[PDB]
Amino acid sequence: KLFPKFSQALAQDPTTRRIWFGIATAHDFESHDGMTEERLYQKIFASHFGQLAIIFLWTSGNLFHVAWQGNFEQWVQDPLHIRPIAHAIWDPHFGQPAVEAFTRGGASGPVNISTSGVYQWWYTIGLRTNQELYTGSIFLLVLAALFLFAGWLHLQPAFQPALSWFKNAESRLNHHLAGLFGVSSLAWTGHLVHVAIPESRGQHVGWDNFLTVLPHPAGLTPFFTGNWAAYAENPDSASHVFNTAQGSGTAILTFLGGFHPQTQSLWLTDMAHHHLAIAVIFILAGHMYRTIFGIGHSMREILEAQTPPSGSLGAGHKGLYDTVNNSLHFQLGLALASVGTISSLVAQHMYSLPPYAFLAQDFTTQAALYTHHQYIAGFIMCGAFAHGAIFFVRDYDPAQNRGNVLARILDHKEALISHLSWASLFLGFHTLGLYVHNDVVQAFGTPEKQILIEPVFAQWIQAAHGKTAYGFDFLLSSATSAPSLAGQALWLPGWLQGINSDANSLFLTIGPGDFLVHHAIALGLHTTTLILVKGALDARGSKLMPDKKDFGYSFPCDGPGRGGTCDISAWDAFYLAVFWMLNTIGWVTFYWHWKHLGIWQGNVNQFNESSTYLMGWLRDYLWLNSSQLINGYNPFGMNSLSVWAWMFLFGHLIYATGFMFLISWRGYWQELIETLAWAHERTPLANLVRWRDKPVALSIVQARLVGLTHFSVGYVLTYAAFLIASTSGKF
Amino acid sequence: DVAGLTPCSESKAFAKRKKNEVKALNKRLKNYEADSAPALALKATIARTEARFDKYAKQGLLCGTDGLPHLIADPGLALRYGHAGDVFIPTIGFIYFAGWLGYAGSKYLQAVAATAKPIEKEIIIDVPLAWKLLWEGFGWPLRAFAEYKNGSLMEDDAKITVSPR
Amino acid sequence: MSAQFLPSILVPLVGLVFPAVAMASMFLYIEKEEI
Amino acid sequence: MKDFTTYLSTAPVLTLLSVTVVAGLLIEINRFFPDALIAAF
Amino acid sequence: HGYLLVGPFIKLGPLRDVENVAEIVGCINGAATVLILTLCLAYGAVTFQGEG
Amino acid sequence: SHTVKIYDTCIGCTQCVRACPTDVLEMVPWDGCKANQIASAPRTEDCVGCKRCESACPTDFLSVRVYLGSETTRSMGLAY
Amino acid sequence: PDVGPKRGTQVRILRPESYWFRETGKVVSVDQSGIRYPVVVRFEKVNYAGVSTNNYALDEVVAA
Amino acid sequence: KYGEESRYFDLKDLENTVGSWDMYGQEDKSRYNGLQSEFFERAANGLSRREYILGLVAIGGAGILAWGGKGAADVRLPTVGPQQPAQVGPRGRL
Amino acid sequence: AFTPPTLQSDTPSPIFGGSTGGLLSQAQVEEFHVITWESKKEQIFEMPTGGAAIMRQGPNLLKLARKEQCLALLTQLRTKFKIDGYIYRVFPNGEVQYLHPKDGVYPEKVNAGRSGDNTNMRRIGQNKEPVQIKFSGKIPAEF
């Protein structure tokens, strides 16, 4: 009866809704009984330590499983003909053909073929042996234990920091930029130069001999005399072979750009140079704000001074420092927005500029990594907007935000929502109309009547990069231009060789189907932003419900009065926008996967004349690439793709089980549960036992969340199964 | 050649596509007698296909890797290379016609809003008034610009409902 | 793969023993009345 | 016929006749001017 | 109930087609008795912690 | 255990009291409106949260506001 | 003396929480007994509940 | 109850009016015969306490783990048997 | 002053055939409500639990699982029969609490002598902002 000790209101519920909401309100510390702000922030800090320990344990487990059951030794010697092994399989449900079908990469028993790209990353950063991976796993185990001890320690009242320490923004930014960002990047440069650079050239460097091996034959003296160009003397040749000393070099900070010819990945010396420059700039950035040494910035005064005259922004940024600092939800929204955008950047960059050795030959790994980071980015961006809506519901003070840009953007929120609606409506109308017109003219036997708008602007920017394929001869595509001549002895040769080659993903050739799918992506982003922005801006109140801020961020409705108030809270707007995020990321990853499937087969045409109409999308992509997937098991037997077929049907089942909660609502189920309670309360031989908690139907918000969770899980599992099966079974 | 595209008058794959379509229609032909109604229908379809392909080659459309016409949606890039009819001229045409329809509907709204029962006039449409305003909406751009310069096109924000933030 | 017996013990431990004990423990704790 | 013409002026009758005449005009435009991909003057 | 649960595992278990099905089914039923036993344990511990 | 509140915009039309299916609302004497009566909620422990009172309030915006809160065996409307 | 706007005049609602905020309404009656919201304002535009009249105070209503 | 006519409520006899009944439970001392009752209470003697009936589940889980240690292989089971060649893959891999 | 009427336990019940929607296990260990009304003739009404019942001449006694069922029966008696009634809350320990016509007259009619609680003297939009009551365990409207 006293299980939700954080919420005595929930503990007095004599139903199963008590435990259901006890699970789901456990991390809403602000809503907990007897919660001060000091205890809030200290709990936040300790939970952060727990999360860091969890992440470190997870990567240590990856290292230990690859070192213990993987084929890292065999993969290092033959990176292009050995399947990386994730972990061994011990499932007593396997029949004998399942045991044979899962024994693949030279292992003793059934194993899972890794698609996470940890093999390429660890091989690139200089890890060569299973002993090194085990040492890394043990070190991460110890450091996660240390972080757990720190989380315990800072909850103790002798070591609990003050609330003002948590809100010390200038110091936290200074140390994060200078130390967490800068010093870490400098240390990664040190690892790359000391370990990864020699291990890329067949020279083993470890803790036993890194103090007796010289990273550059002219040690430190060029660094200290300012002759820094001596660290970029002889780069690795185009004939260089990875992990061997054949045609290597001595330079540690090259600057050639492009890709390594053998690994089809970026130069490691380029990475060391990049990380060193990033470390310098981030340490400088961390020397910006004022702490205790009489120099630096007060960010409050910077926000005060950012008020343009003539009342263009009203009061400008009056009191935004306190608005951000007092609100944990504002900070969490900013952090989630930035982190989701960075995750999208990571997805968009690692496929086109492959960083790790022998990446972009493992086609399943690239597709899986891209789709993973894109889905993570979409979820995190929805979380950013949801926490912005929470900040409007909870932490927004109109008095201290009077005249500043927040009050201005809340003042004319109808214009923002209406213009997002106009943009989404235009994009949906036009993209769907062009697609349906193309479908109809394709069906009627007239492909020449298609509307194929050439993406001339994106092709123009591609030409500005040096892509001499559309004949613009603009900036970098003309060698006579000032940017072309400026770095022609710098990054221009390698970058131009990468940009003019059709064998990589460095800015692929685009056509009308790319135009149509880019407008589809624009429609998805616009509509998801419309739902999320409308939910945030209408979170405090609307015309249908003026006092919405009093009812909280999440609540079922306001009853059937005033015409009906279903899905009126900002939580419901986030709920509706998660579907649109899933649809948008589905479009993005469908586009990426079909384009790269055309590229990897050498048949760019299949996408070029099949993406302009939707029947080509359904038939030449969804229907065609699922043939090996659905034959993972059959009456004639089974093979290694059986797990992805089972996960395919599994995700379909979870998706429709989500539809169950999505369509049916709480009222039929409550009557059914009452009828079954009547049945059990007077069934003979079962009246001996009775429920401690009264069985009730799931609440409206709870079942909306459950249906959304099943929808997302089925979506993700289905697409992951299809993508990994259709790429790994084919390549 | 505006973006690596070749004109469909000289692109080989356009002629190949036209030949394939005509050959498929001839394969359809080679089953009926010469003067039957299906024969006349297929002959008309063939004539329409050849006319369409010859017109597309005549109008100066751009073909990509294969023989499919591509449209240019950049002013200047389509103006100086003679493809303003791809997007720009239909852009002007749609803007004019949509403005005509929208201005006619707007003027109907403001005409029936100042009547005895504006509620009834929107389900029971005054047909002569609608016809007159549809005719008057052909001068929509000049009327709209005049009302914008007069300030009578937009409404002051102090007379428009908003939510209580 | 060294120590092949260890998955054969650990997988039932985290699939049957630890989950059954955790589910029983949490079921006891959610209805502890007076913790 | 005042009530009959008022019924003809009702929103569904007028919108069905209007979409009918617009669709017929577009259909006869495509009948006499088929396969107009661009606005070539 | 223990004499009840033998039959489904005998005629239908994964090792139903081998001679030693009886012993393996006895083991399965011992495990089933143990898990139903801890179900009774948990029920009696949660519903009889006081008086009414 | 639902929070039901009455506000001074109430005109004393007694429609919220008539709409209540569990007898939560009642009319008490008042001097702030023409009808000389305002609504009151002395029995919010019997409130299920159906918001039928809100559906009957003619004041814009409504004067009988129901805030769903803690759930009991009577707020959940259980017969078992 | 009579208080509030005259009967039948044109008034604008200044209650930001009302449906007809900054809209057009006509005064039907103003009570002189001392009602907290004596001004009765009728609108041609109905709200979500379907009513077209509402009671307002004195400082949330300006004429014309 | 006092249901001699149509009166199904009584505050002095509120037990029967509420609906609390035995349905089928009846009180009787006679059921099981001699010696076997003592046999079974001796069989389930000290085990009646919650901690020892928990320890029975503990040794049951020990048996669950003993199957994995030595018991899965005694009934063969494909997850611990041997393997027969391998497959290459789509392209030149392993 | 007003005094509540006593719940006369030995009161006849309406003629009924027995339903499945009646009392359950909640009545024994939490609560069951009861409604009493005076009928002027033998006539058929509708049960809140489903089915038709005949209430008899004079006093009629009916116990129901929830108060909402009692008020549904009372309002259908008041509309389709013009019959008033009394509802009582009966605890299993024996204590009986009077319920709906608490002060004699119906709640939709004023009585002059009631408690006017939960009546705020402000408007809807005059509640406090949630940031000004942050970390309090109360909604803005109960300040």
Ligand code: CLA
């Ligand atoms: C130089 C001193 C210093 C350093 C090193 C740190 C370091 C850290 N602090 Mg701390 N802090 C400091 C000073 C410092 N702090 C001071 C002075 C204060 C008081 C004003 C605080 C107050 C404070 C609070 C309140 C909290 C922290 C927290 C944290 C942790 C952040 C979470 C994390 O690990 O993500 C790691 C971040 C990065 C790795 C940056 C990466 C940049 C982007 C996101 C990724 C891109 C990089 C690259 C492309 C990825 C490639 C890797 C891939 C190959 C695997 C982190 C270890 C949080 C915490 O977790 O609690 C323990 C937290 O709650 N700090």
Ligand code: CLA
């Ligand atoms: C740094 C990330 C971060 C952090 C710290 C928070 C923190 C918080 N969030 Mg938030 N959120 C985030 C990201 C984050 N969020 C993201 C990315 C999203 C988009 C999905 C959301 C969307 C969101 C919403 C809509 C809400 C919150 C809420 C909250 C607050 C309470 C949390 C809670 O409800 O209890 C604990 C939360 C849980 C126990 C999550 C439930 C479990 C999920 C739904 C099911 C997972 C099933 C799993 C995937 C199945 C495996 C599949 C396999 C079996 C096949 C809390 C302060 C709530 C709030 O503010 O209260 C008003 C609120 O309603 N968040």
Ligand code: CLA
């Ligand atoms: C594929 C999605 C899906 C699934 C699985 C279900 C499943 C179910 N629905 Mg449902 N429904 C759905 C979609 C779905 N629905 C949608 C989209 C709607 C909207 C129109 C509805 C609307 C609806 C209504 C109105 C009703 C149901 C009812 C039911 C239940 C019927 C009882 C039954 O089938 O017996 C058996 C259960 C199953 C077949 C489900 C799968 C169980 C598997 C096959 C076996 C279990 C083994 C398990 C996985 C092992 C445990 C592993 C452990 C680790 C957890 C059942 C659980 C009815 C009900 O309440 O019960 C009568 C009811 O009236 N549904």
Ligand code: CLA
């Ligand atoms: C002639 C009436 C009329 C006019 C002038 C407008 C004008 C406008 N609408 Mg609107 N709209 C209308 C009717 C109209 N609408 C109708 C009937 C609907 C219901 C389907 C909508 C639904 C709608 C939505 C959901 C949105 C707009 C939006 C907008 C604005 C963006 C531009 C646009 O074209 O969006 C697109 C307009 C449409 C998709 C609807 C067009 C429907 C037809 C073609 C118009 C009606 C013709 C009318 C019967 C002619 C009468 C002739 C007369 C002589 C009797 C704009 C000012 C957007 C906005 O808010 O921008 C900020 C927006 O989000 N409209």
Ligand code: CLA
């Ligand atoms: C979070 C990281 C993680 C994950 C997801 C897994 C997952 C898995 N491990 Mg593994 N393990 C890990 C870390 C991890 N491990 C680490 C760091 C070590 C070094 C000590 C090991 C050592 C190890 C061995 C020796 C074996 C496995 C095995 C397995 C497989 C079956 C589970 C099992 O029976 O072993 C149980 C796992 C452990 C006893 C240690 C795992 C402890 C992790 C770090 C807990 C992390 C929990 C997480 C942070 C929060 C989740 C909430 C949770 C506490 C409820 C399974 C796929 C077995 C296998 O190979 O299958 C074929 C096997 O025999 N693991």
Ligand SMILES: CC1=C(/C=C/C(C)=C\C=C\C(C)=C\C=C\C=C(C)\C=C\C=C(C)\C=C\C2=C(C)CCCC2(C)C)C(C)(C)CCC1
């Ligand atoms: C709800 C809400 C929220 C949230 C929001 C969000 C979510 C936002 C966002 C957003 C985003 C997500 C954004 C993004 C961004 C970015 C940007 C805006 C940028 C930029 C810049 C530029 C201009 C660039 C340029 C360039 C290029 C183009 C490339 C190359 C280089 C250069 C530099 C040249 C908050 C909490 C706050 C508050 C409350 C409410």
Ligand code: SF4
């Ligand atoms: S929500 Fe329903 S039960 Fe509660 S006061 Fe309003 S009408 Fe009565």
Ligand code: SF4
């Ligand atoms: S319905 Fe509204 S206005 Fe009428 S008495 Fe109830 S609270 Fe007052």
